[PDB]
Scaffold this motif. Structure first.
Motif, PDB file in Angstrom:
ATOM      1  N   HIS A   7     -17.950  66.278  39.925  1.00 10.92           N
ATOM      2  CA  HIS A   7     -16.926  67.139  40.153  1.00 10.92           C
ATOM      3  C   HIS A   7     -15.997  67.081  41.281  1.00 10.92           C
ATOM      4  N   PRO A   8     -14.799  66.794  41.229  1.00  8.31           N
ATOM      5  CA  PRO A   8     -13.629  66.622  42.504  1.00  8.31           C
ATOM      6  C   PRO A   8     -13.714  68.042  43.216  1.00  8.31           C
ATOM      7  N   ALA A   9     -13.595  67.699  44.723  1.00  9.89           N
ATOM      8  CA  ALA A   9     -13.148  68.806  45.386  1.00  9.89           C
ATOM      9  C   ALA A   9     -11.683  68.949  45.627  1.00  9.89           C
ATOM     10  N   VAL A  10     -11.266  70.302  45.813  1.00  2.00           N
ATOM     11  CA  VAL A  10      -9.943  70.549  46.085  1.00  2.00           C
ATOM     12  C   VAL A  10      -9.399  70.704  47.256  1.00  2.00           C
ATOM     13  N   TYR A  11      -8.405  69.935  47.411  1.00  4.74           N
ATOM     14  CA  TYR A  11      -7.761  70.085  48.965  1.00  4.74           C
ATOM     15  C   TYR A  11      -6.204  70.458  48.956  1.00  4.74           C
ATOM     16  N   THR A  12      -5.785  71.362  49.915  1.00  4.65           N
ATOM     17  CA  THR A  12      -4.482  71.462  50.135  1.00  4.65           C
ATOM     18  C   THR A  12      -3.761  70.353  50.451  1.00  4.65           C
ATOM     19  N   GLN A  13      -2.550  70.075  49.877  1.00  4.83           N
ATOM     20  CA  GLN A  13      -1.698  68.723  50.096  1.00  4.83           C
ATOM     21  C   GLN A  13      -0.787  69.081  51.120  1.00  4.83           C
ATOM     22  N   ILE A  14      -1.266  68.341  52.452  1.00  2.00           N
ATOM     23  CA  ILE A  14      -0.612  68.705  53.612  1.00  2.00           C
ATOM     24  C   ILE A  14       0.852  68.386  53.816  1.00  2.00           C
ATOM     25  N   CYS A  15       1.140  66.976  53.205  1.00  2.00           N
ATOM     26  CA  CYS A  15       2.403  66.553  53.141  1.00  2.00           C
ATOM     27  C   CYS A  15       3.628  67.590  52.748  1.00  2.00           C
ATOM     28  N   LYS A  16       3.014  68.592  51.952  1.00  2.92           N
ATOM     29  CA  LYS A  16       4.046  69.469  51.348  1.00  2.92           C
ATOM     30  C   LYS A  16       4.202  70.652  52.333  1.00  2.92           C
ATOM     31  N   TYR A  17       3.519  70.970  53.462  1.00  6.29           N
ATOM     32  CA  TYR A  17       3.677  72.220  54.231  1.00  6.29           C
ATOM     33  C   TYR A  17       4.216  71.730  55.551  1.00  6.29           C
ATOM     34  N   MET A  18       4.817  70.425  55.772  1.00  7.12           N
ATOM     35  CA  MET A  18       5.052  69.733  57.100  1.00  7.12           C
ATOM     36  C   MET A  18       6.340  70.760  57.559  1.00  7.12           C
ATOM     37  N   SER A  19       7.095  71.380  56.823  1.00  5.04           N
ATOM     38  CA  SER A  19       7.953  72.442  57.527  1.00  5.04           C
ATOM     39  C   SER A  19       7.381  73.581  58.337  1.00  5.04           C
ATOM     40  N   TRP A  20       6.677  74.047  57.550  1.00  8.88           N
ATOM     41  CA  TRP A  20       5.929  75.313  58.182  1.00  8.88           C
ATOM     42  C   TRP A  20       4.900  74.970  59.121  1.00  8.88           C
ATOM     43  N   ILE A  21       4.091  73.737  59.300  1.00  8.52           N
ATOM     44  CA  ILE A  21       3.259  73.313  60.189  1.00  8.52           C
ATOM     45  C   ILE A  21       3.953  72.953  61.493  1.00  8.52           C
ATOM     46  N   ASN A  22       5.158  71.997  61.476  1.00 11.57           N
ATOM     47  CA  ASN A  22       5.692  71.428  62.598  1.00 11.57           C
ATOM     48  C   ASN A  22       6.453  72.662  63.294  1.00 11.57           C
ATOM     49  N   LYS A  23       7.035  73.644  62.482  1.00 12.02           N
ATOM     50  CA  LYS A  23       7.665  74.770  63.145  1.00 12.02           C
ATOM     51  C   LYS A  23       6.831  76.027  63.905  1.00 12.02           C
ATOM     52  N   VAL A  24       5.699  76.143  63.303  1.00 15.79           N
ATOM     53  CA  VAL A  24       4.606  76.879  63.858  1.00 15.79           C
ATOM     54  C   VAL A  24       4.046  76.415  65.332  1.00 15.79           C
ATOM     55  N   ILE A  25       4.208  75.112  65.346  1.00 21.60           N
ATOM     56  CA  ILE A  25       3.673  74.371  66.589  1.00 21.60           C
ATOM     57  C   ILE A  25       5.062  74.319  67.350  1.00 21.60           C
ATOM     58  N   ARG A  26       6.019  75.078  66.989  1.00 21.84           N
ATOM     59  CA  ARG A  26       7.210  75.087  67.591  1.00 21.84           C
ATOM     60  C   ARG A  26       7.725  73.694  68.257  1.00 21.84           C
ATOM     61  N   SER A  27       7.223  72.516  67.607  1.00 21.28           N
ATOM     62  CA  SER A  27       7.755  71.132  67.584  1.00 21.28           C
ATOM     63  C   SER A  27       8.700  71.197  66.371  1.00 21.28           C
TER      64      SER A  27
END
Length: 203
Positions: free
Chosen positions: A182-202
């Motif tokens: 059975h495969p594990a389920v991961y969040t696709q990080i390349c889809k969140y890059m707008s939120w991640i970068n902006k929370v880092i306030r980068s």
């Protein structure tokens, strides 16, 4: 497995004195993990007593957070000192395609204490539907473990690294133990890059 000095970005998060989740270091002040990990409070022990121990201040859960957007950013009370032992992991500039060869390094939580690395294959977010009919394939990665590998070696929120970049955060799909079918389920990080970068306030 897991050559020494590899995974300088590996973060283990503790609640109280007890191991809670695993994470990634995306910035000298910022650790990323799954939103299902935060109860609060947590504190980060980062790098591969101890290497560097930081307390977390700001916990930013993904605004649209059975886990739909399972992501949270934890800001360290003080920046880590960057070095070969401890560095951030590069964020994805692109999305990993089905069939790519990636890696996950776990400590064996869920049942000396080492990191073990294993190769993993990106399945298609359709093949994911045969094990979990009704999963919304959304922004996610179904990651196939090679056969004979016990999925429960991994941790919660641990990174999935493809081609030296971070493509995923372990969300669910680890259980049952004792089988790689059975495969594990991961969040696709390349889809969140707008939120991640902006929370880092980068930004």
């Amino acid at each position: 497995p897991c050559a020494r000095g590899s995974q300088p970005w590996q973060v283990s998060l503790f609640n109280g004195l007890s191991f809670h989740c695993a994470g990634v270091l995306v910035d000298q002040s910022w650790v990323l993990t799954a939103a299902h990990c935060g109860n609060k409070p947590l504190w980060a022990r980062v790098g591969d007593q101890g290497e560097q121990l930081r307390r977390t201040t700001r916990s930013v859960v993904h605004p649209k957070y059975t886990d739909e957007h399972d992501l949270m950013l934890l800001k360290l009370a003080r920046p880590v000192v960057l070095g070969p032992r401890v560095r951030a992991l590069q964020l994805p500039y692109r999305c990993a395609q089905p069939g790519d060869q990636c890696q996950v390094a776990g400590w064996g939580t869920t049942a000396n204490k080492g990191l073990t690395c294993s190769s993993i294959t990106i399945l298609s977010p359709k093949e994911c539907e045969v094990f979990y009919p009704g999963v919304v394939t959304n922004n996610m990665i179904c990651a196939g473990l090679d056969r004979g590998q016990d999925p429960c070696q991994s941790d919660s929120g641990g990174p999935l690294v493809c081609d030296e970049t971070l493509q995923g955060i372990l969300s669910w799909g680890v259980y049952p133990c004792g089988s790689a079918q059975h495969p594990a389920v991961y969040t696709q990080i390349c889809k969140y890059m707008s939120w991640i970068n902006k929370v880092i306030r980068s930004n």
